Amino acid sequence: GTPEEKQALQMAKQIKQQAQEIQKQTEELLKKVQELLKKLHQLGAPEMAKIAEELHKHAEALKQAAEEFYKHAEELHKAAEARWG
Amino acid sequence: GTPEEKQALQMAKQIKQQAQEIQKQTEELLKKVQELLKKLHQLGAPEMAKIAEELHKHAEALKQAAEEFYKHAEELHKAAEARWG
């Protein structure tokens, strides 16, 4: 394999790793938002609860975007390995 | 702030902090995708370029969701401080 092909193979593997790491992080963050939401609902805090529920929708969007990225990162790694692995 | 209020405020701070950590990693990840693209365009591997460009789209989408999450998280933390901090 050429130095360059080998380089691109390794870049793809690194992107896949970082994608995995970010996805886990997004899962933990959603959990934290859920937790906070439960507490604010118990606190009779309607205006805080309202923004906490919009924040939970954003945490869902973030976890979803991370998962979508990871799917394509795996696909790119697969394709690189097929060619150059 | 009552103890439970102060707890919700700490939970918001921790959500803010993790949001900042995630945004930073999504910036890094997009840089990696950009650098791979440069390399794949160079190797004239158009199928690989096609995957990488799709991944480029997803990296921007992911970084955008992390930025939007962080904006909302900071706004919630700041309201929580207004009430309880």
Ligand code: NI
């Ligand atoms: Ni896609």
